[PDB]
Symmetry: none
Subunit: 110 residues, 12 copies
Amino acid sequence: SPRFFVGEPKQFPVGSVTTLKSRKIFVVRDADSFKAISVVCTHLGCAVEFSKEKNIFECPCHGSKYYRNGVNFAGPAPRPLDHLQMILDNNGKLAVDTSVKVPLETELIV
Amino acid sequence: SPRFFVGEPKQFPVGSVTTLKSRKIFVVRDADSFKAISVVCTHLGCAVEFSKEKNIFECPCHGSKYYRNGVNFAGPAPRPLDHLQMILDNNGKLAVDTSVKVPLETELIV
Amino acid sequence: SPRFFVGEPKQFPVGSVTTLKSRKIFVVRDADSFKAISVVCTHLGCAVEFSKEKNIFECPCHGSKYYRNGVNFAGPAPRPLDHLQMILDNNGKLAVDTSVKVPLETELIV
Amino acid sequence: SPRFFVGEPKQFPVGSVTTLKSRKIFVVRDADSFKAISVVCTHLGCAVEFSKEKNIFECPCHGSKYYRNGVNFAGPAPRPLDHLQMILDNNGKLAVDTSVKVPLETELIV
Amino acid sequence: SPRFFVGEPKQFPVGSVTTLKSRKIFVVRDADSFKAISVVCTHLGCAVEFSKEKNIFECPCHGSKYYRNGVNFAGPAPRPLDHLQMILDNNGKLAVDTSVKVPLETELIV
Amino acid sequence: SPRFFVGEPKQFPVGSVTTLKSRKIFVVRDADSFKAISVVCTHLGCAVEFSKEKNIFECPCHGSKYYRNGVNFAGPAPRPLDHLQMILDNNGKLAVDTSVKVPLETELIV
Amino acid sequence: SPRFFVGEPKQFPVGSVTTLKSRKIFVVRDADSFKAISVVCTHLGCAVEFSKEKNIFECPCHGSKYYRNGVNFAGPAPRPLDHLQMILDNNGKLAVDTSVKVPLETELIV
Amino acid sequence: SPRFFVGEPKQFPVGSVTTLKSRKIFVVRDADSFKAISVVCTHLGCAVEFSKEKNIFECPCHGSKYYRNGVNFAGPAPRPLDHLQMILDNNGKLAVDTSVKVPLETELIV
Amino acid sequence: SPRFFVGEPKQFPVGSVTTLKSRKIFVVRDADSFKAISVVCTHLGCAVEFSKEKNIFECPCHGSKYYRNGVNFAGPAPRPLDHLQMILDNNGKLAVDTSVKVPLETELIV
Amino acid sequence: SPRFFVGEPKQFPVGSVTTLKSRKIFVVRDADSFKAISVVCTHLGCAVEFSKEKNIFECPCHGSKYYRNGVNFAGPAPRPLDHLQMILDNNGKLAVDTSVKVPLETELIV
Amino acid sequence: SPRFFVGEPKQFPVGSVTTLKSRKIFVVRDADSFKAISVVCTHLGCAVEFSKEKNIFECPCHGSKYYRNGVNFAGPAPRPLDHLQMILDNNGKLAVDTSVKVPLETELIV
Amino acid sequence: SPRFFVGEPKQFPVGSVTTLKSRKIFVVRDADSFKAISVVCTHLGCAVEFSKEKNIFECPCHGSKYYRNGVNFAGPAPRPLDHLQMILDNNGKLAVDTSVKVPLETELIV
Ligand code: FES
Ligand code: FES
Ligand code: FES
Ligand code: FES
Ligand code: FES
Ligand code: FES
Ligand code: FES
Ligand code: FES
Ligand code: FES
Ligand code: FES
Ligand code: FES
Ligand code: FES
């Protein structure tokens, strides 16, 4: 299913990028702002990996690189990573919908 | 309460702008894309009104005017109209969160 | 410190909004009622500025707008500005404690 | 004629002072309370202007100053500005009778 | 009541400035000439205070300053302090009418 | 003895100059502003006379002429005519004190 | 040059206000008392003209008005007209220093 | 109709922009240089307004902005504001002709 | 001058924002969609700069900030950046007309 | 070819709607603003015809009706008529590209 | 140090007066011309402030007023504000030397 | 005899009160402002003496005490010390005229 819960905002450290391999998403929290970024490389579909030390997203298939917000700056990647719809449910749980693409600037503050 | 249901997607005609006075929002449907736009003028807070013939939003207070997308072009309004988070709930009804403002180009496909 | 003096009531004009940039608060006097409003924008935390010309609060970071009482009406601000505890000390000076938030329409009559 | 319409409440911003120079009155809206104040200075009869920046009324003829409520505090003005009868008509229009002067604290809630 | 008695000429020392806080006036005696000066700052209405050593009036709100005669020289004050009507009554007591403002150069000899 | 009552403001037409020969004063009413002007010519002391047509004061002794405000403009008159203290007593009657000279711009509003 | 002669005391009539457009000052003689007053309006600097009939100074730009002593009472002028240093030279001619401003009550008797 | 008087050079402050709404022109004075600028926006013909605070011209219809000299820099305005001919009549009156458009660099020195 | 070529579509990388300082415009390519955006800040006219990492336009003068599409969100900028008419000429190279502003959502696909 | 010329701007009277059957477009002139609107009904593709008497576009197939700007308001038409790219070439004739759709608010000023 | 950097010419709007409060200077840019004006009032040394609304410099200590070019016209200020040395460094940075005063007519064009 | 010179501004240190008993005046220098104050006690005419320690003027005859500006505060002295006319002659020497008394707030800045 594209729609699913990810956890309460407390399960995510401030300034952390959490990788959900099965869900095909990153959960990026900056201060109190939350973002959901897809792991799918925009080149041919490989799974991008985040490096904490380099603070970038890197594709091991053809060397595409993305900044923390997902914008492509190196490699054959032609466009930024897809940002996904993320809401806080009525019971304090974060919900992500991979079927709903959102503009890159979208953020969820808690 | 800023969180509330708005109706099923089919209660909104294709290519129509629906004014929900009580909820102080607009529900704009273009083809199958839905947007939620606040009625509050970004100047001093008056409730703007949509003109179907002129295809623009007009404020009754000092004459600020916005395009269909919410971009301000006339009057002292310094910002575009606020776009609001709108989700499709599993019970088939559209829900709007007034407290969550979203980027201008956000859309929900059905 | 969260606790500090802001001056005597006679130092504040009737119908005035006084910005204490160091203390990061506003002192609002309407007739004989005094209010303490925090400058911290409820969006991402920037310091809002009061527009004497437009009688509203403006945040320069993302364009949030608040009414004189602190209630937001435009921009990404989700909730009204924080009102702070304000007491009249024995020595005739007004004392504000930013650590104690008070309801929106709280007021100190003198 | 001493009776005229001034518009619907939705045409007046919250916390605004509107000058109707032809009608020679002010329309003051605080929250949902409406007040009608005459522009005639109580000194020698000149037309008083409202200063949005200073939140006061000032007469250009001899320098009288009035608080936002119309009470004089500086200049040769002897008594506060006249407040006028303001009614909400059944057709949603605000009606003012400038020949009927009302007490200072009179207000119309909507 | 704006009309009130203030006292006989002998209760005010020669070359003294007497502050009537409750009456919101100054009684200035130079030799045998008496003057009644209002305490209200012509900027936004705060109560100014007289400094005998500096021989000037100072407003505690925004730093407007007035000379002994009431002429403003510092701060945003756009007008001199209001001079008030003062008479010597039948019973030898001075009466002040704050509702009657008099030109700056007015004086009462005894 | 030099203090005396002159009558109620109703006994003086608007825009009229009334000569009180036994009181050696004028009572000038413009709209609702009253002035008390001495009839003593500032040249050698003759009694000046007002012309309702020419709207000026004329001295028949040596041809000195004064404006309605008392300003000398013709003849050997060195000064303007003296303005005198005039108050509205508690019993609604106008009182003039010829022993108390006031600045030329003094006026009494009723 | 700021310093210059304006003539001998007897070249100025008693009770006269003489305008010296060449030097942009007024020479006011009341009996034997002389004053030097600048023509520059304290608002935005226009040349003020004296009306002998009204006995006031008037600015042609935005309607500021001053009394004979220079005190502002009408218009946006926030300060009285500047009074200038004036001495009686040994050779019997009056000298004015425009660069040296003096208190408003200053007078030079000859 | 296209030729009319606007007043004498003494009626315009140094470094001022004067708006003549009834005549649809601006009078700009820098030092002793006078310029006439048309208020007609070069976009679709609305009347532009001068912002004293921002030292720019603003059109309220579609948000075009012009510098003080009339050159457009923002908005759909394609060309700078029209400069109009201004002559100094030999009787001391300034005359403008809105029908005669002149280069932006032309000026009338007095 | 307002009309000029900018080059062929192949000379602009996919997902790139190229700044043409000489012509004071941006050429934005998203996939095969092209856009011409002016560099002039809609506040006071300074040249904004694009941050590839932050994916925003920033004004160096007073801190106005714009999204990739030109929508203003920070600073005193009251309107979005101007979008410009851009054509693909017959000889295969793109042409821009600075004099012709087009709606914000305009795009040229190749 | 979808890129064709239409004539000079003066070939179209002010306030006219010109239907070009062979080119499948409308040319709309309001004052000096030009628009190119496609005749294709957005329902099933019939050629829409304009009515001058009632200032609307009408599809003869199933009764779809559009406002003068192309906005659909009657019939099964789900979206407004397509607006087309229209530029003024160097040779003084307008060029239309039916293959380049533009936003509804696009206009060409001459 | 009296000599310090101010920034790049791109950081200053056209036709602007920029206040560097900590450095006690103004930076005035007209077109491509730059000038530096000291904030020290020539009266007694207080820091003057620029009024964007009135396009003048104001000193709060004794009410001195200066034109935009810095010359005094009202108040006890005896001489115009000081202009300061301003040089363009070969690394593209503007530098001001507080200790080196230059004539008002000196300008730095870029 | 009463019109005598005192010396160049060099010979008076900053913040000093120099007693000239043969000329019977004080010379007070605050920063660059000079004042000439008579030594004659307002009580009966004894020569008061300045105490650099207590920063006051004291009369040895009956205990009258003045503030540094000449304002009387102790003893039977009824009015402040006389301030005398002081001018800077073109040869760099200050000239004092004991026959010309000036307001207390008079100052001479060099
Ligand atoms: S699939 Fe990711 S870089 Fe190619
Ligand atoms: S509140 Fe909408 S234009 Fe002012
Ligand atoms: S921090 Fe205030 S609007 Fe974003
Ligand atoms: S008429 Fe208003 S102050 Fe005189
Ligand atoms: S109220 Fe007195 S200076 Fe502001
Ligand atoms: S006494 Fe009046 S003119 Fe001589
Ligand atoms: S310059 Fe004198 S009132 Fe404006
Ligand atoms: S008419 Fe001025 S911008 Fe449209
Ligand atoms: S000019 Fe761009 S923010 Fe001021
Ligand atoms: S095709 Fe036009 S109404 Fe069906
Ligand atoms: S220091 Fe500026 S006027 Fe006195
Ligand atoms: S003379 Fe000085 S106290 Fe008497």
